[PDB]
Each structure stands twice: as structure tokens, then as C-alpha cells.
Design an enzyme around this catalytic site. Structure first.
Site, PDB file in Angstrom:
ATOM      1  CG  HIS A  26     -28.672   5.350 -39.616  1.00  9.22           C
ATOM      2  ND1 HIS A  26     -29.343   6.539 -39.814  1.00  9.22           N
ATOM      3  CD2 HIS A  26     -29.035   4.917 -38.387  1.00  9.22           C
ATOM      4  CE1 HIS A  26     -30.087   6.804 -38.757  1.00  9.22           C
ATOM      5  NE2 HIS A  26     -29.918   5.835 -37.876  1.00  9.22           N
ATOM      6  CG  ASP A  83     -35.423   7.790 -40.352  1.00 11.30           C
ATOM      7  OD1 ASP A  83     -35.615   9.022 -40.251  1.00 11.30           O
ATOM      8  OD2 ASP A  83     -36.254   7.025 -40.904  1.00 11.30           O
TER       9      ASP A  83
HETATM   10 CL   LIG Z   1     -33.274   6.196 -35.917  1.00  9.83          CL
HETATM   11 CL   LIG Z   2     -32.018   2.617 -35.202  1.00  8.85          CL
END
Ligand SMILES: [Cl-]
Ligand SMILES: [Cl-]
Ligand SMILES: [Cl-]
Ligand SMILES: [Cl-]
Ligand SMILES: [Cl-]
Ligand SMILES: [Cl-]
Ligand SMILES: [Cl-]
Ligand SMILES: [Cl-]
Ligand SMILES: [Cl-]
Lengths: 239, 240, 234
Positions: free
Chosen positions: C204, C208
Site C-alpha cells: 500500500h 492503492d
Molecule cells: Cl484503496
Molecule cells: Cl484496498
């Protein structure tokens, strides 16, 4: 551990904003022990209502009414009933917030913006829809203030915009939980021993396990489920 | 370092030593163990039908009710005897597989969460398991739950189906190797021999310590539980 | 520890475990899943498998088609073919797919290099060779190096959904689950289709849901277009 596998590998420098988003995600995962829980929801009544009124809504108001506004509202009302989910871990105490301020994800092509709808419980569906199109409009123009990004107490992400069916999200530290609203999919389901065709949606919740367990998470998810499934022409007012 | 308050009227709730211990345990487990996750669908129709056929006369004779959960505990315990790698502990130098199959079960009361242990669950009958469930859940609501009941667990099973959940990822009860969530039993349209059938389907969701286990062992283990549950009928299953 | 069994951890098994630990600590994992219609793939594979094994000497599996679909999608989405490096993200010019071929006791992750430039036949061949080298303890160091993305065939263990640990320092791992016949809705009619879940774990810091979703849609579209006249093996 090599980070390159060719001379022609492209290096992309990371600005201050992007690095701060990444540091936030790392802090969240390091500090919060995440657990996850999922519930299926019949969204047929919501789909039918939205599609009935969407066209005259855009004529009268000038902005569109998405499914998302209804989900925000249903989450907002459920948080009134469950303040433990609208909370923060603080070492020796849990702080339950008096404001229901819902962080929503609106991502750009490059990065991810998380603006906040303040006092979402006190707004109507029309009001939430207005705020969503405004915040998306400000995210597209890059004119998003820090007051737009602050004070969030709960996060809702519309992962169904990206076509996902199930997802697990990272909690927006120092919040207690994040809800992912997935894609609405026509499915064959069973109602009173008969096969029906309904518009189903998964709700996927990540929780801070220091604060919450399955019992409270389940009761909260059921509350959102009941709020969504009660949506019809007679029961739900847009204003 | 970020702000923790957003109003003067925000309520601060102090955390007692018991809830603070549970919370510290959850954090230790997540830091120490790299979790990975697996899920299988299980046809529990035989189990539902058999349980509902016998539940009424069981409560009359024994004095306590027989739940679906008792069958699952038995199915898991047998599969742990098949795959002792799941009934284990990381020790840096070595991996210790435990001979005793002691199943921690999650019983929650409101906000606080208890995990009492059913010792040697592979040797108990479904009847015996049901007895110990009602005993431990009775003492959990009363608060008369001893420390000896909380100790010695080698595997954890959580009945997340009681909270209406369909899928879940749980946090492994360290220093154990795995945790199983038994989800809600839901009637579903299903394909059997190219026909559409209505079956009572249940998801089994497993978190694993990936230092000890991979998908291969976890898949085999889940298949064993699946086979144990799916073979349940009037002729195959004895309660005593 | 009365009748307990102790299994010692050698240097290789300890290295795998340390790698799993480092990955989870360094990478903040998020997860995403889509359902894909693999009926066209299943029908095509089954129609052509027997004459394939006779002519080539090695078998054609479902997995070879999935590697190809992922590799093609990685051409459009180099952001998934990447590495976190402090102040920079490094996008890799090579699409080198790490695959899990666990043979017997432990887990082996060799790498199909430049998988985008190989045919389905070529990929099937390489899977056969790498599985054979894993079984015979003949995997070179070059075979273990250079991976930029990982795909795991968890369906072989009967998994329906899965969340995998990312092969650090990669950005993402894709788990291909079991193909199950399911009642499904197509144009308001009930059909029976061969459905497979694709489960994706992402870093992350790099990615995204929007990018991850587009990527999964590209793989979905690649798999769902596989038919009797569309895709060539060679
Ligand atoms: Cl997201
Ligand atoms: Cl997500
Ligand atoms: Cl976590
Ligand atoms: Cl729990
Ligand atoms: Cl973890
Ligand atoms: Cl849980
Ligand atoms: Cl694995
Ligand atoms: Cl993580
Ligand atoms: Cl896995």
C-alpha cells in the site's frame, strides 16, 4: 536484496505528499493489530430506489446521486448506535468520539486523497451526495484544504468503484475501523426456500482488535445491513 | 503523536488490566507472527439435518443443548490428529508439535473476550464436547472462569457465525500456529452433478503462521475438516 | 513437552521463515479480490490437452494460461511490476514471474523470466522444467533470482479464497484459487459457469485500490476472452 533487475529499470522519485501517505500506511499496520470480518447485504431496494430517482435528481440539483451516499448515511446512523466503533486507542484508555466524521477515499491516477464528511449523521442523503461531488471536484482540481482532510473518526472506502468483490483495507490510524463497500453484483440467492435474483453487496470491515472483537463488529455490521435492506420508496427520504 | 481527540465532549473509557492484557496479546501475536490466510466452502447440510433431528431429545436427556459448534470442534480435533503440524509452536531453533489436542474456543461477553480450553478434544465425544461448551459458556457469563480453563491451548477455533459473519480473518492466539473461524451456515444455490441444489454452506477461514506452514499443509488440513463435516449423517456419526 | 515432537529448523527452512517475517514487517499489506469466468479457458484447455501432451511430452495446465494473462496485464501496468526503495519507486523493465512450485516437504519459488515474451506453450514447458528441477534438487541460483511479481496456484490445494504474503521486495502477489462450477447470472438468466477468484495482496506504499482494480480488470478481461478461436498456444 537487490532492488534492480535491469539497467533500463525506471526510477520514480517520491514527493512529500506520497511519502507521507506511505508513512501513514506503515504506521497504521505496525501500530494496529487488524482483524477482518465480512457480511453479505441485499441492496436491491437501494438499487431500485436510486435508479428511480437519479435522473430527476440531476435535473433539480446539478450533481449526481451515487449509491455511495446511501451507504455513508447507513454507516452514519449505525455509528450513533455503536460509539465503540467511532473510537481511538490511547494507551490506557479508549476515546469514544462525539462527532461522526466519516473519511471517504477519493483517489487520483497517481495517489490517494482521504477527505472527511463532518457530522455525517446530521446530513441528509442529498447533503452527503452534494459533499461527495464537491470533494471529488476539489480533488480533481488539486484545491483540497487540510481542514478537508482532518478530524476523521471512521473511514468508508468505495472499492466497488474499482470492481472489487471483496477487499481488506488498512485502518486510518488512529481510528478503530474501516469499512469497504464492494461491488453490487446480481446473484442467485435463496429466500424462503426459493431461488431469487437479487443485487448483493459485500461489506468488509477491518477492526482494531485492541478495541473491538467479533461480537461488537458483527452487531455493527448487522445494523448497517438492516439500514440498507430497509431502503425502499416509502421508507427512505432524500431530505 | 497525531491528535486523539476531536471534541471536548469525547468520552474517555479507562482500560482495566484484563482487557489491557488481551489487547497486548493481540499486538504481540501480530508483531511476532506473519499471518497468511485460507478459506474453503463446506457443505454442512448433513450436519444441520442430523443436529436438528436429535437436538430436542438431547436437551431432554442431558439437560444442556447440542449446538452445531460441537460437531465442528470434533471435526477439527480429528483433523489435528491427522495433521499435527497445525497443532504446533515456533521455537526459533525448532518447531514443537504437541501431542495433546487442546482446543481454545472463543466465548465473548459484551465487550470482553474469553478463550477457555477444551483439553484432549480428540478423545471426547460430541456429547462430551457439548457438555464442556455449555459449562464454560455458563461460567463465562457468571465470571466464575478459572485460570486453569484458560491455559494449555494448542489450537484455536472461533465461532464467528454467532455474530452473523460470512467470512473472517482472525488473529492467531500466540504461541499457537493457526486459528480457525467457523462462519455462518447459509442456504445457497449450489452445483451438484450439473444440477442446481439448495445446500447449507459454511465457510471455514484459517489464519496460519507462515514460518511454520504453507498453502499445501493448510489446504490438506482444511480438506480433512471438510471431509469430516461432509460425511456427517445418521449412519456415519455417533454422539456417544 | 511430554509426547511432543521436535522438528529442527535447518538454514534453508529458517531463511524462508525470516523472509516471510521481514515481508510482513516491511510491507503494509492490503488485499483485493475479483471473480472471473474461466469457462472459455477450461473448455479450450480440455479440448487441446491430450494432443498437446502427445506432441510435446509435457502437460498443459490451467496455470500456464493464467501466467500469460498476468504477464500481458503487467505490460499495461508497470506500477505493479515494482519495488519500494525509500525515496524512490523502481519500475522493472523485465516481467519476471516468480511461481510457487512446492514439491514434497517445503516451498520452492522459481522465476519464469520475461514471461510476457513467451507463448503459453513456452510457459507450460518452463513450468514442467522448473517442477522437474525442484523435484530433483537441481534448481540453480539464477532460477531463484530476479522475480518482479509472484503468482501462486493455491487452487491446487483446494483454496477458494486466499491472502498471500508478498515476496519482498516485490509490490504484489496474485493468488489463483480453485475453479468451481457455480450458478451465475448472465443477462437475467441463471447460467452454470466455471468461476475462479483472483486474490491480490499489495504494498500500500506503492499501490492503492484504483490501480489494483484496473490491473485485476485487465487480467479478468484477458482470461474471459480465451476461447476456441481467439488464443493461440504457439
Ligand atoms: Cl484503496
Ligand atoms: Cl484496498
Ligand atoms: Cl495487522
Ligand atoms: Cl474475535
Ligand atoms: Cl501478520
Ligand atoms: Cl475476528
Ligand atoms: Cl503458500
Ligand atoms: Cl501487513
Ligand atoms: Cl497462502
Amino acid at each position: 536484496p537487490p532492488v534492480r533487475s535491469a539497467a533500463g529499470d525506471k526510477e520514480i522519485p517520491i514527493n512529500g505528499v506520497r511519502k507521507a501517505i506511505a508513512k501513514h500506511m506503515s504506521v497504521s499496520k505496525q501500530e494496529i493489530p487488524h482483524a477482518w470480518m465480512m457480511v453479505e447485504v441485499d441492496a436491491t431496494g437501494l438499487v431500485r430506489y436510486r435508479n428511480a430517482v437519479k435522473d430527476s435528481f440531476k435535473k433539480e440539483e446539478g450533481y449526481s446521486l451515487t449509491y455511495f451516499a446511501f451507504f455513508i448515511k447507513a454507516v452514519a446512523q449505525a455509528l450513533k448506535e455503536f460509539p465503540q466503533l467511532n473510537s481511538t486507542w490511547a494507551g490506557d484508555k479508549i476515546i469514544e468520539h462525539a462527532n461522526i466524521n466519516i473519511s471517504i477515499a477519493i483517489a487520483a491516477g497517481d495517489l490517494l486523497y482521504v477527505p472527511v464528511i463532518k457530522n455525517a449523521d446530521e446530513k441528509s442523503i442529498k447533503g452527503i451526495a452534494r459533499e461527495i461531488s464537491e470533494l471529488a471536484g476539489k480533488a480533481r482540481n488539486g484545491k483540497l484544504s487540510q481542514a478537508d482532510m482532518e478530524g476523521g473518526t471512521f473511514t468508508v472506502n468505495s472499492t466497488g468503484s474499482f470492481g472489487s468483490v471483496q477487499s481488506m483495507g488498512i485502518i486510518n490510524h488512529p481510528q478503530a475501523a474501516i469499512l469497504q463497500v464492494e461491488s453490487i453484483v446480481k446473484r442467485p440467492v435463496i429466500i424462503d426456500d426459493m431461488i431469487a435474483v437479487r443485487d448483493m453487496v459485500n461489506l468488509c470491515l477491518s477492526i482494531d482488535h485492541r478495541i473491538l472483537d467479533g461480537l461488537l463488529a458483527g452487531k455493527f455490521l448487522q445494523a448497517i445491513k438492516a439500514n440498507v435492506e430497509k431502503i425502499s420508496k416509502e421508507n427512505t427520504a432524500l431530505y
